Amino acid sequence: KFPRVKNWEVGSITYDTLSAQAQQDGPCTPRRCLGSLVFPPEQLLSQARDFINQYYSSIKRSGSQAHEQRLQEVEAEVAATGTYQLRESELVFGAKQAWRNAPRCVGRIQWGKLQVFDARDCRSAQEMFTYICNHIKYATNRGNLRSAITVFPQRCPGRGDFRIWNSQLVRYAGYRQQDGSVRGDPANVEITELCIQHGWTPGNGRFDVLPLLLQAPDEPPELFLLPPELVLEVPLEHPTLEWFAALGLRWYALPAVSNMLLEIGGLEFPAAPFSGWYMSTEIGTRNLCDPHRYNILEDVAVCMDLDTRTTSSLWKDKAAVEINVAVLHSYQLAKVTIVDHHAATASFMKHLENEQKARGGCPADWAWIVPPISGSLTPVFHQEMVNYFLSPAFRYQPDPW
Amino acid sequence: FPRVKNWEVGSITYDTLSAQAQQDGPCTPRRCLGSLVFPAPEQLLSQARDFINQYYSSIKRSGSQAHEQRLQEVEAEVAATGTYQLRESELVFGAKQAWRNAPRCVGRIQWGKLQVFDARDCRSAQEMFTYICNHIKYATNRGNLRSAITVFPQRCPGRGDFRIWNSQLVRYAGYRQQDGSVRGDPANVEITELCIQHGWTPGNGRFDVLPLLLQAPDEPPELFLLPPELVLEVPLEHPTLEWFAALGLRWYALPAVSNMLLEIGGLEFPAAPFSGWYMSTEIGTRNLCDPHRYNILEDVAVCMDLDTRTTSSLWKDKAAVEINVAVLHSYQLAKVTIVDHHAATASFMKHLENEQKARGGCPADWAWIVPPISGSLTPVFHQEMVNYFLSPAFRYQPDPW
Ligand code: HEM
Ligand code: HEM
Ligand SMILES: Cc1cc(N)nc(C#CCN2CCC(F)(F)CC2)c1
Ligand SMILES: Cc1cc(N)nc(C#CCN2CCC(F)(F)CC2)c1
Ligand SMILES: C[C@H](O)[C@H](O)[C@H]1CNc2nc(N)[nH]c(=O)c2N1
Ligand SMILES: C[C@H](O)[C@H](O)[C@H]1CNc2nc(N)[nH]c(=O)c2N1
Ligand SMILES: [Cl-]
Ligand SMILES: [Cl-]
Ligand SMILES: [Gd]
Ligand SMILES: [Gd]
Ligand SMILES: [Gd]
Ligand SMILES: [Zn+2]
């Protein structure tokens, strides 16, 4: 009843007993597996008890003193008001646990080192902006990146919602032409349309940093320019391919996801941006080489004089590896924290064993943990994984339009 | 009906074929287990009934004279004998469907082009051998490979199974060592021990072709050596790295899986080896670079004068891409059929479009379809997929020892 999980490199066997706790049912049934699809009143008290019980067991405080105590005040809080506020340490503990429970994150070896900014006493887009701006500057830290989450006020009935309209805090523009096709980042084309709609002058460049669209509850959004000296970017150069710099490619330093919904103990924070540091394949393989992204792969291969006339020359494979080398080299020369997919996967194997000892398993999404280049050269490829839903969690949510 | 998106293009289809999935898989709504490698007359009647229905749809004679005659016939044969016999046309269709239905085969654009050898009159292990040599000969075809399957007698009450103990018709010995290491292919240490135990005189090379261990019903397995001139091989060299030839590396031309059970209309064929042609990543990435297989990756990287002390130089990625280049160039030099992962995955995308129009979907195992290097450079990475079990089917079965 406890899934047997094998590692095929070594032959070791473990049993995922942690799977027994899954709440939000996944997309799969005995009839068919759907694991590769991207996006597959007093219920508030059940999840509240469960979260509080977690907290105290994690501080060796189950069934003692403040445990009994803290259960009542939230019971009383919901009774009177129909919701509750999290003790500061609980918000801290739930944010770290959500990151710990993110099956698609390969960087969770870091889950215990998280800096939580409490922005629950917020109102207005101007208030959001300086909170975001403090996050960005703290997390960037002149390139010595530091994990951070800013938690904006939770959700209540009657009132609108705090939402960041960008999927990340730093994204590049996407402009069309006299021919439908796109200049800049095609992923963001749509929010670039909303920004220009709300009175922003589009640039020319392929690497203009989009302005933020910040939304106070029940009020339409407000365009903000970010302070440019606050957006740390890295010009991309290759260590031995002198022409690579001339391609004018750049990527920003901070990956800061600003569209997911943090859920702790039963409360839903639709605005709660978290940031870490990049794994190089995210930039060098997905952002730059995806056919529906910057799609640069063939331009680099021409420059390398590779034979693009037959796929069996593996020119795609060759150009992709170099693009990744240029990302790692550029970030390291610019002294910005970055991790290669080999270092990151091996740390995740370390994470998995830690979690086997601590919690009896770890939810992991195999399709997202395995890197998008060189899959079977990393140890996660040969590791079987179990995927399920634990709380607290980061959840997807509809676009606020 | 599961909605399936292609993320490179934007397409959206619904998998209605999944609604007919018979046997159950390993996942539940609680937990996905997709990444795991190895997850009564009346029921025989209902399987057979469904297959016969299938066969008559494919000949555009559904609900006809011959259709009900065969249904009636099969029930009379199950009642009289507890089993029934496939006609030859039904056997050919059922083996082609088993390939069509195989979720972990990326080669299924070719499913209709399959050579079916009916060995169901096979009498002994010695005749079994003769049938297998002819299969290898036909399929190899001097390097112009042809897809084939030989079907040996079905499992039946009163008599044991025919079995090929070898997992493939062509496999290289793996010998344990003085210092606990393995010479040759470590995947094959167990079967090698069995051959020696069964009277084989081992060699001591790294690429020694294993003899066949062939089990006639209620017989111990019998040893048969493959005539050297039946096993086409390919010395491996690199188009520019001339020291590569000095590694002494080879691979065989024919991939012939011999340990799977073919299932048609409820009947079971525990011995029915099938074979196609390689995709270069199986040899280059998995067979040669897996740490638990030949594991040449670091040795290749040293020779390339890559810096193997830091993972961020991407030495592993660079040495693996050249190993694949060498595999492709070597098989093309020798005029032995081979497909690279870019051509293979593009033809699999055409298979999914053919299959959507034909059946309303296609069972696909994302983690097996996506190649082990350069995944997001192939279009199957960006394709969501539905995994499920259709009959007729190839199934895994326990090792006969
Ligand atoms: C500090 C170093 C970190 C690294 C190297 C890292 C790495 C990654 C990578 C490569 C992905 C794949 C996402 C994609 O391909 O779209 C991912 C996903 C994710 N990570 Fe991490 N991450 C880090 C920090 C964090 C932090 C601090 C949080 C939250 C507190 C977090 C939460 C998540 C979530 C929720 C996802 C799922 C994203 C999605 O579904 O789009 N990560 N991570
Ligand atoms: C004609 C060219 C073919 C190509 C290029 C091809 C390709 C592949 C590849 C790359 C795999 C994954 C195996 C692995 O990663 O270890 C696979 C699996 C498989 N293929 Fe195909 N194949 C071909 C022909 C065939 C034929 C003729 C059959 C059956 C009649 C077949 C049935 C299967 C099955 C059952 C599996 C799953 C094997 C397993 O789970 O171990 N294939 N194929
Ligand atoms: C914290 C963190 C660290 C890291 N290394 N990567 C990520 C990411 C991502 C990709 N992001 C793109 C925008 C989005 F689709 F909205 C969410 C997914 C996040
Ligand atoms: C017909 C065919 C074509 C192709 N290109 N690859 C294969 C394969 C395989 C994988 N093989 C690994 C060893 C085994 F477990 F014994 C059987 C499965 C088969
Ligand atoms: C459909 C498929 O699951 C999809 O392309 C996934 C595969 N794995 C991924 N893995 C990561 N880390 N990020 C992604 O966007 C994807 N895309
Ligand atoms: C544990 C993991 O599922 C295992 O390594 C799988 C992954 N995908 C694979 N895919 C193919 N095509 N062949 C394999 O042998 C494997 N191995
Ligand atoms: Cl990104
Ligand atoms: Cl093989
Ligand atoms: Gd030039
Ligand atoms: Gd040379
Ligand atoms: Gd050597
Ligand atoms: Zn599943």
From Swiss-Prot, chain B:
| Residues annotated as binding L-arginine | Q168, W277, Y278, E282, N287
- Cellular component, GO, one term: Golgi membrane
Binding residues for (6R)-L-erythro-5,6,7,8-tetrahydrobiopterin: S35, R286, A367, W368, F381
Q: Which UniProt keywords apply?
A: Calcium, Calmodulin-binding, Cell membrane, Cytoplasm, Cytoskeleton, FAD, Flavoprotein, FMN, Golgi apparatus, Heme, Iron, Lipoprotein, Membrane, Metal-binding, Myristate, NADP, Oxidoreductase, Palmitate, Phosphoprotein, Zinc
Annotated positions binding heme b: C105, Y396
Localization (cell): Cell membrane; Membrane, Caveola; Cytoplasm, Cytoskeleton; Golgi apparatus
- Keyword Zinc-finger among UniProt keywords: no
One of the GO biological process terms: response to fluid shear stress
Residues that hold Zn(2+) according to the record: C27, C32
What's the main place this protein lives?
A: membrane
Q: What does this protein do?
A: Produces nitric oxide (NO) which is implicated in vascular smooth muscle relaxation through a cGMP-mediated signal transduction pathway. NO mediates vascular endothelial growth factor (VEGF)-induced angiogenesis in coronary vessels and promotes blood clotting through the activation of platelets.
User: Which family would the database say this protein is a member of?
Assistant: Belongs to the NOS family.
According to UniProt, the name of this protein is Nitric oxide synthase 3
The species this protein was found in: Homo sapiens
